[PDB]
Amino acid sequence: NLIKQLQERGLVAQVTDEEALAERLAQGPIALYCGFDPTADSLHLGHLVPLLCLKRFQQAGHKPVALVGGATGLIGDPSFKAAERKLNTEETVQEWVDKIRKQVAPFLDFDCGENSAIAANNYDWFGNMNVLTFLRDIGKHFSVNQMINKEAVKQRLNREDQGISFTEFSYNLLQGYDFACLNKQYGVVLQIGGSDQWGNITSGIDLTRRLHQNQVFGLTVPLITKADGTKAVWLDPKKTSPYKFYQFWINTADADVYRFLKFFTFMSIEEINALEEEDKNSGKAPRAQYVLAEQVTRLVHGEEGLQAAKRITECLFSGSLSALSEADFEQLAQDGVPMVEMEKGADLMQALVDSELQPSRGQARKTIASNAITINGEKQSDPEYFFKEEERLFGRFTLLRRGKKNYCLICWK
Amino acid sequence: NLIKQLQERGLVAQVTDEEALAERLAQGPIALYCGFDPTADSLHLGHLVPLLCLKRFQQAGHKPVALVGGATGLIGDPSFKAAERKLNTEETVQEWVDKIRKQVAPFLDFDCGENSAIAANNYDWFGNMNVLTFLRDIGKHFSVNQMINKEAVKQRLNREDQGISFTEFSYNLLQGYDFACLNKQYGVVLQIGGSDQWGNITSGIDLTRRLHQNQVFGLTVPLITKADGTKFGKGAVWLDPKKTSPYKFYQFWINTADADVYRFLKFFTFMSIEEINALEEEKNSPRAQYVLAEQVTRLVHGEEGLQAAKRITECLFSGSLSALSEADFEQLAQDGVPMVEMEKGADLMQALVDSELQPSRGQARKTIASNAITINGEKQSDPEYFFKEEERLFGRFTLLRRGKKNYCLICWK
Ligand SMILES: Nc1cc(CO)cc2ncn([C@@H]3O[C@H](COS(=O)(=O)NC(=O)[C@@H](N)Cc4ccc(O)cc4)[C@@H](O)[C@H]3O)c12
Ligand SMILES: Nc1cc(CO)cc2ncn([C@@H]3O[C@H](COS(=O)(=O)NC(=O)[C@@H](N)Cc4ccc(O)cc4)[C@@H](O)[C@H]3O)c12
Ligand code: NA
Ligand code: NA
């Protein structure tokens, strides 16, 4: 059972009429969908959870539909959000829609026969729908009594300051109608998404019945709570660098790593169980984090992205910046380590103070005399030192390190 | 001051920023409006209360807009209604719109210069409004927290089985936008209606501030509760003479209770307040009910309708039917007196049975013999009598009275 496999990965929060849905999956290929609203330049890690689930369904022969909310992004999903969001402009939303559509596409196969993926956009049907048609044909099927009691919006109806507009209150009906549109258009019988989307999904199941007299299903994937109780890292490399992305996975807590392998990679459950059991009986610290980091970093940023993240990680730890490119240095200045902008000619002592690495020039004196300051890796032990011109690599980068762990990159101006 | 005068008639339930509206009315003509939704093929006496108020404003030099809800009648006003209403089709709503527009027109001056009345229909702007445009441009200004605290819908928001659909819940936004739309189109700065419409009116005052940065006002007229606790009008008394004959209409007013009649002159007539008060002084040994019936019947059904009602009332009181026309007997058949259809050749005994004036032929015989029965106002005491052909007036009508008061109209088949 595909559903059963997803359960042992931890990827099933809830599922409507599980026995019927499972019989439909065993019967043959179904079509399913997940929606993504455009609220930013790019998706982030959280979005991968249902997005990679679409691919898991496709790998079992089913047909995934990835919807971008061209219309619903002009409305705003309130589900489990504490505060009303400001409306975005049509112009901004459209540019975001195109970027998110192009981000989604490489994660699904658009060329594998009958079950090839489909890109969709609900603006196609909401852009020409009259309000009276929407109020009558769709709105009559919704009880405000039930709507105001849904978990996703209940808390917004406590105090009026942090209330909810009629605009965001109507969102649930737009996403409901989406399910009925994709049912009629492509035979979609399953919608998946995170557990916050449950109420938006069941509205689409019910409305699809009332409108199209068809039985469809929903399945939710979990929202991740870390083992310690906690929870942004974008897929766009110009927002989160491949090096920062890689390091984020490297620092995964021991109690989260195997679950995260299940959620964010396509490693078999057997290989994941073998890794956990190797980590268990080996008398060393876990190595799973390195496996997770390579896996997801290659997935999102490719082999080139992976090797650059490794190369930077290696040089930062070794002290040898000779391997690094200019582009490698640009990731460091974006994301990887704290940075400052100093005009050339400064001595190493005033380098430490201005970056908030050393408090005073007198403290920098003893710090530099104690052989505790590296410059691009090579020890420099004398206070009165100035940077040689060769040390400013690619004309604009030198990397300070106090002790072993404290970094600042100076981007000379 | 037009507002003070209306208050002396008891026609003002509530008013917003009253001092400010009063100064605005005193400065010069304003444009004002009232809306009427098509829920039947005719208006009834209730609608007269705000409709005649539109006229009262026009007589003071202001410009009335009478709006018929071609769009809101496709949605359904839930305010202070115990139960969800069934949706009406576009075809039948359009029928009602034109009948109601034609009913309303004679009550206002459409040809008196600058302040000529205007007929409006909110389908002209809602019939083609896109739903996203509606949810964004209008629905963002509406707090759901506030909507569910409107008195008009509180009784519907407690239990799903007596609940409210998203359809009827949104009605408040359409009426709110109407006000803003009429403000921009015509400079409308005032909306009137019954006190049941208060929440719909104040939502339009608010939205007009948000959309057009303009100050507008609202004034409501009371809902009439008769002095004996029962709600006014209750079936209903329709303006359409094919639903309520002018004779039935006139008798309704003739039989007003003395505790109501002076309140009803103020509400349903254009008599001066000074005259109404003078009439109430009667203690010299009341004309009020007759003045009320005369005024409103002339208003709604014209002089001809008034003379018809009086002519039938007198003929029924006197028993002499020679004044009644065939159209007059048709009013009687419609709703004036009990009627029964009978095949020609029935005898007097059977007519009395079939009309339920008598329970059996044996009893009818005695009753006839006792001289209790009139035929077209003439005594007939022969129990074995058959009607004469000349007693079928116009070939089709014969009026029976048993005793001094119990009528039944035979309509010969
Ligand atoms: N799964 C998951 C896990 C984590 C780690 O704990 C963080 C996440 N952050 C997000 N997600 C999940 O990503 C998906 C997209 O997110 S969204 O754009 O906000 N979606 C919406 O706003 C929908 N209303 C879009 C929609 C529009 C039209 C339609 O017809 C159907 C749907 C959702 O299924 C989230 O549950 C996360
Ligand atoms: N005043 C009064 C008194 C009595 C004696 O007790 C009985 C009455 N029965 C009715 N009324 C009054 O007649 C008017 C029409 O009634 S309605 O069609 O139901 N209206 C509606 O449904 C509005 N939503 C129409 C509307 C639409 C668009 C818009 O932009 C503005 C308004 C209302 O002002 C009632 O208060 C009565
Ligand atoms: Na989703
Ligand atoms: Na009204």
Residue numbers in the entry:
A (entry chain A): 5 to 235, 243 to 424
B (entry chain B): 5 to 238, 242 to 289, 291 to 293, 297 to 424
Published text:
The aminoacyl-tRNA synthetases (aaRSs) are essential enzymes playing a central role in the translation of the genetic code and hence constitute a viable target for the development of antibiotics. Based on the structure of the catalytic site, two distinct classes of tRNA synthetases can be discerned. Both classes activate an amino acid in forming the respective aminoacyl-adenylate (aa-AMP) as natural reaction intermediates. In view of their resemblance and irrespective of the class, aminoacyl-sulfamoyl adenosine (aaSA) derivatives are well-known high-affinity aaRS inhibitors, but they lack antibacterial activity due to their low uptake potential. Structural analysis showed the flipped 2-hydroxymethyl-1,3-dideazaadenine base is partially mimicking the interactions of adenine within both series of aaRS enzymes.
The compound was unambiguously built inside the active site of tRNA synthetase according to the electron density map, which confirmed the conformation of the flipped base. With the present modification, in most cases, the amine group occupies the place where the N3 of adenine is normally residing and mimics its interaction with the protein. In the case of class I aaRSs, only two polar interactions with the base are consistently observed for the different aaRS:aaSA complex structures, mediated by the interaction of the protein backbone atoms with the N1 and N6 atoms of adenine. In this work, the flipped base loses part of these important interactions, providing a good rationale for their lower activity compared with aaSA. In addition, the hydroxymethyl group of the base makes H-bonds with backbone atoms of Val583 in LeuRS or Ile228 in TyrRS, respectively. However, in the case of SerRS, the base moiety adopts the syn-conformation relative to the ribose defined by the torsion angle (O4′-C1′-N7-C8) of −124°, while the base bound in the active site of class I LeuRS and TyrRS and class II AspRS remains in the anti-conformation. In the case of the class I-targeting compounds, low-nanomolar Kiapp were obtained for the 7HMDDA derivatives 32e–f and 1.2 µM for 32b targeting TyrRS. While these values reflect high affinity for the target enzymes, the inhibition is 5 to 420-fold lower compared to that with the original aaSA analogue. While TyrS7HMDDA was about 400 times less inhibitory compared to TyrSA, the 3DA and the uracil analogue only gave 10-fold and 15-fold reductions in activity, respectively, while the cytosine congener also suffered a 400-fold decreased inhibitory activity.
